Scaffold this active site. Structure first.
Site, PDB file in Angstrom:
ATOM      1  N   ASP A  44      28.262  37.976  43.267  1.00  0.00           N
ATOM      2  CA  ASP A  44      29.443  37.332  43.743  1.00  0.00           C
ATOM      3  C   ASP A  44      29.621  36.019  43.644  1.00  0.00           C
ATOM      4  OD1 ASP A  44      31.993  37.234  45.416  1.00  0.00           O
ATOM      5  OD2 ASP A  44      31.147  39.369  46.295  1.00  0.00           O
ATOM      6  N   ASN A  83      35.137  31.067  48.563  1.00  0.00           N
ATOM      7  CA  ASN A  83      33.735  31.449  48.160  1.00  0.00           C
ATOM      8  C   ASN A  83      33.047  32.188  49.283  1.00  0.00           C
ATOM      9  OD1 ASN A  83      33.767  30.432  45.345  1.00  0.00           O
ATOM     10  ND2 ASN A  83      34.008  28.490  46.433  1.00  0.00           N
ATOM     11  N   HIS A  85      32.925  35.660  49.945  1.00  0.00           N
ATOM     12  CA  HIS A  85      32.878  36.758  49.418  1.00  0.00           C
ATOM     13  C   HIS A  85      31.409  37.407  49.783  1.00  0.00           C
ATOM     14  CE1 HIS A  85      37.169  37.160  49.693  1.00  0.00           C
ATOM     15  NE2 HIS A  85      37.243  36.028  48.981  1.00  0.00           N
ATOM     16  N   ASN A  99      19.020  39.895  67.019  1.00  0.00           N
ATOM     17  CA  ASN A  99      18.877  38.517  67.225  1.00  0.00           C
ATOM     18  C   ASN A  99      19.992  37.711  67.972  1.00  0.00           C
ATOM     19  OD1 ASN A  99      20.665  38.788  65.046  1.00  0.00           O
ATOM     20  ND2 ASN A  99      20.026  37.204  63.993  1.00  0.00           N
ATOM     21  N   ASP A 155      39.614  47.137  30.237  1.00  0.00           N
ATOM     22  CA  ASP A 155      38.474  46.083  30.130  1.00  0.00           C
ATOM     23  C   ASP A 155      37.149  46.447  30.700  1.00  0.00           C
ATOM     24  OD1 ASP A 155      37.634  43.600  29.096  1.00  0.00           O
ATOM     25  OD2 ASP A 155      38.144  42.543  30.943  1.00  0.00           O
ATOM     26  N   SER A 259      35.915  46.404  47.824  1.00  0.00           N
ATOM     27  CA  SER A 259      34.958  45.372  47.946  1.00  0.00           C
ATOM     28  C   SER A 259      33.949  45.284  49.054  1.00  0.00           C
ATOM     29  CB  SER A 259      35.706  43.867  47.543  1.00  0.00           C
ATOM     30  OG  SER A 259      36.956  43.772  48.062  1.00  0.00           O
TER      31      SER A 259
HETATM   32  C1  XTA Z   1      38.084  36.238  45.554  1.00  0.00           C
HETATM   33  N1  XTA Z   1      37.108  36.430  44.628  1.00  0.00           N
HETATM   34  C2  XTA Z   1      37.413  35.444  43.375  1.00  0.00           C
HETATM   35  C3  XTA Z   1      36.479  35.756  42.146  1.00  0.00           C
HETATM   36  N2  XTA Z   1      36.634  36.890  41.718  1.00  0.00           N
HETATM   37  C4  XTA Z   1      36.493  37.274  40.605  1.00  0.00           C
HETATM   38  N3  XTA Z   1      36.477  38.676  40.397  1.00  0.00           N
HETATM   39  C5  XTA Z   1      36.232  38.910  38.898  1.00  0.00           C
HETATM   40  C6  XTA Z   1      36.383  38.105  37.966  1.00  0.00           C
HETATM   41  O1  XTA Z   1      36.201  38.632  36.651  1.00  0.00           O
HETATM   42  C7  XTA Z   1      35.397  39.197  36.185  1.00  0.00           C
HETATM   43  C8  XTA Z   1      35.795  39.762  34.805  1.00  0.00           C
HETATM   44  C9  XTA Z   1      34.927  40.506  34.117  1.00  0.00           C
HETATM   45  C10 XTA Z   1      35.264  41.346  32.835  1.00  0.00           C
HETATM   46  N4  XTA Z   1      34.687  40.509  31.634  1.00  0.00           N
HETATM   47  C11 XTA Z   1      34.928  41.132  30.539  1.00  0.00           C
HETATM   48  C12 XTA Z   1      34.030  40.709  29.267  1.00  0.00           C
HETATM   49  C13 XTA Z   1      34.497  39.400  29.079  1.00  0.00           C
HETATM   50  C14 XTA Z   1      33.498  38.838  27.793  1.00  0.00           C
HETATM   51  C15 XTA Z   1      33.911  37.520  27.127  1.00  0.00           C
HETATM   52  O2  XTA Z   1      35.053  37.236  26.989  1.00  0.00           O
HETATM   53  O3  XTA Z   1      32.827  36.627  27.363  1.00  0.00           O
HETATM   54  C16 XTA Z   1      34.204  38.551  30.205  1.00  0.00           C
HETATM   55  C17 XTA Z   1      34.963  39.213  31.436  1.00  0.00           C
HETATM   56  C18 XTA Z   1      33.723  40.897  34.809  1.00  0.00           C
HETATM   57  C19 XTA Z   1      33.360  40.392  36.187  1.00  0.00           C
HETATM   58  C20 XTA Z   1      32.297  40.696  36.646  1.00  0.00           C
HETATM   59  C21 XTA Z   1      32.150  40.801  37.973  1.00  0.00           C
HETATM   60  C22 XTA Z   1      30.890  41.022  38.730  1.00  0.00           C
HETATM   61 CL1  XTA Z   1      30.825  40.788  40.490  1.00  0.00          CL
HETATM   62  C23 XTA Z   1      29.857  41.426  38.041  1.00  0.00           C
HETATM   63  C24 XTA Z   1      29.894  41.422  36.560  1.00  0.00           C
HETATM   64 CL2  XTA Z   1      28.546  41.949  35.737  1.00  0.00          CL
HETATM   65  C25 XTA Z   1      31.070  41.105  35.918  1.00  0.00           C
HETATM   66  N5  XTA Z   1      34.357  39.492  36.686  1.00  0.00           N
HETATM   67  C26 XTA Z   1      36.488  36.437  38.435  1.00  0.00           C
HETATM   68  N6  XTA Z   1      36.278  36.304  39.489  1.00  0.00           N
HETATM   69  C27 XTA Z   1      36.353  38.364  43.033  1.00  0.00           C
HETATM   70  C28 XTA Z   1      37.455  37.628  43.925  1.00  0.00           C
HETATM   71 CA    CA Z   2      22.356  40.291  63.855  1.00  0.00          CA
END
Ligand code: XTA
Ligand code: CA
Ligand code: CA
Ligand code: CA
Ligand code: CA
EC number: 3.4.21.75
Length: 470
Positions: A44, A83, A85, A99, A155, A259
């Site tokens: 995260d 940040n 989450h 505790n 994706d 989430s």
């Molecule tokens: C309030 N928060 C703000 C931040 N947020 C967020 N969520 C998600 C976030 O994008 C992503 C996007 C992806 C998709 N992928 C596809 C291949 C691409 C290869 C390249 O082109 O190199 C790169 C992107 C995956 C993930 C991901 C997330 C986790 Cl937890 C673990 C893994 Cl393994 C992959 N995450 C960016 N920010 C959540 C909400």
């Molecule tokens: Ca506690």
């Protein structure tokens, strides 16, 4: 054993309840299972390691900062609390008990860490480094996020991340396999369909959806056949939410969304691993299938599969049941080696038009070392063109008669790019015998005159051999 005394434990209704509308965690605690010896990592935006309800359980060996390339996953503080989450999720798993602070984690004696990976550019290399962190120290990884939940995106992981998943399940945990727990998505308002998300749609991830306090499908939920099970989360303004540790050393009662469901599942899985530390990544999915509870979850799509289990695209096999998971874990015989049977279905491309049905009788590799009589996951890898992707709905029917929705209509998806060897996955035929006639249905759900061609349909079966006892 004494029930937790923490001031907000009564507000943790999904743990403290006494009206049978909870995760049945007290039953596991009462048998002495609290997560001792298990290590969980939250993927995260970072983890507030000095939080008064996390410090006692914090494990630097479960933590890294892939955004800055240092070991310390502490989040950055901003006015919008962007940040926060990872800290909320960490407390759901493993907030300290007894505790005087906030509430408790599901696995309140587990060790907890975090990978700071979302406060920066998320690349294939970043994902692979996160999924592959210390895989002989961390047991369980929890990820609550992935590709965009706009109802228009298809994706999934690129090559390095895909290899990290496979290396994790094959070699992590001394060969037992990393357990990757995934949230199925928050895109319900946009009509998102979660098989379009290649992280939750993977066989390597144990995917979790949400139920509201009153037992309903929340506004944000995504339905899909790849989901395995459900934990409680938020709903409407009359329903309670998730109560956990928050950024700035605080306690929140307003943690929401799918989430928030994945970490509760990760905690239940930690209790289960303490009960039987020899469970493999596949064993754990079997336990979830067998023990999860449809009772008191309302959906319009419950259907009974070929082996007599009720399954829903919103809920999978139902609510996780921690007491039942730990009980079955203590009696479980580890499963036979995974087989994979690949079947090329088409002899020629097929016009889709308004509707297409493809029927094929298969032997599931009869006579060969990958013969499958006891199914686990199944995939239909489809390559197709279509003028408006979101108008398509796709179903797969097993020989025993179980209809899996591989794709529901996504009204916001106007892409003309179709699907390129996309491996739609279903858990709904788990334990079935896959020999016999499978049926693929592709339908244009709109009144528009849409058009395209199915050029490849590969049916991929996973599972084991032996007499099928269902
Ligand atoms: C309030 N928060 C703000 C931040 N947020 C967020 N969520 C998600 C976030 O994008 C992503 C996007 C992806 C998709 N992928 C596809 C291949 C691409 C290869 C390249 O082109 O190199 C790169 C992107 C995956 C993930 C991901 C997330 C986790 Cl937890 C673990 C893994 Cl393994 C992959 N995450 C960016 N920010 C959540 C909400
Ligand atoms: Ca506690
Ligand atoms: Ca750092
Ligand atoms: Ca989604
Ligand atoms: Ca999955």
């Amino acid at each position: 054993y004494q029930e937790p005394t923490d001031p907000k434990f009564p507000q943790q209704w999904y743990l403290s309840g006494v009206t049978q509308r909870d995760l049945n965690v007290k039953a596991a605690w009462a048998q002495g299972y609290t997560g001792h010896g298990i290590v969980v990592s939250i993927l995260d935006d970072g983890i507030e390691k000095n939080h008064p309800d996390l410090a006692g359980n914090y494990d630097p060996g479960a933590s890294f900062d892939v955004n800055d390339q240092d070991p310390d996953p502490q989040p950055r503080y901003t006015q919008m609390n962007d940040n926060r989450h990872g800290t909320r999720c960490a407390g759901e798993v493993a907030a300290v008990a007894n505790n005087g602070v906030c509430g408790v984690g599901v696995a309140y004696n587990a060790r907890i860490g975090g990978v700071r990976m979302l406060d920066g550019e998320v690349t294939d290399a970043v994902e692979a480094r996160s999924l592959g962190l210390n895989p002989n120290h961390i047991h369980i990884y929890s990820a609550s996020w992935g590709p965009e939940d706009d109802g228009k995106t298809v994706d999934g992981p690129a090559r390095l991340a895909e290899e990290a998943f496979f290396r994790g399940v094959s070699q992590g945990r001394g060969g037992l396999g990393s357990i990757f727990v995934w949230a199925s998505g928050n895109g319900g308002r946009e009509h998102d369909s979660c098989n379009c998300d290649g992280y939750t749609n993977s066989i390597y991830t144990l995917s979790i959806s949400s139920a509201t306090q009153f037992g309903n499908v929340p506004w944000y939920s995504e339905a899909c056949s790849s989901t395995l099970a459900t934990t409680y989360s938020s709903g409407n303004q009359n329903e309670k939410q998730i109560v956990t540790t928050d950024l700035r050393q605080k306690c929140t009662e307003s943690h929401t969304g799918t989430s928030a469901s994945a970490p509760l599942a990760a905690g239940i899985i930690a209790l289960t691993l303490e009960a039987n530390k020899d469970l493999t990544w596949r064993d754990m999915q079997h336990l979830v299938v067998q023990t999860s509870k449809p009772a008191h979850l309302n959906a319009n799509d419950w259907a009974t599969n070929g082996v007599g289990r009720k399954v829903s695209h919103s809920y999978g096999y139902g609510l996780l049941d921690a007491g039942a998971m730990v009980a079955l874990a203590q009696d479980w015989t580890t499963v036979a080696p995974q087989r994979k049977c690949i079947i090329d279905i088409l002899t020629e491309p097929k016009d889709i038009g308004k509707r297409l049905e493809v029927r094929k009788t298969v032997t599931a590799c009869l006579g060969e070392p990958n013969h499958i009589t006891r199914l686990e996951h199944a995939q239909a890898r489809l390559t197709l063109s279509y003028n408006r992707r979101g108008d398509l709905a796709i179903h797969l029917v097993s020989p025993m008669g179980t209809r899996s929705t591989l794709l529901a209509a996504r009204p916001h998806d106007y892409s003309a790019d179709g699907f390129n060897d996309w491996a739609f996955m279903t858990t709904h035929s788990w334990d079935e015998d896959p020999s016999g006639e499978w049926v693929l249905e592709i339908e244009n759900t709109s009144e528009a005159n849409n058009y395209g061609t199915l050029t490849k349909f590969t049916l991929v079966l996973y599972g084991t051999a032996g007499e099928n006892l269902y």
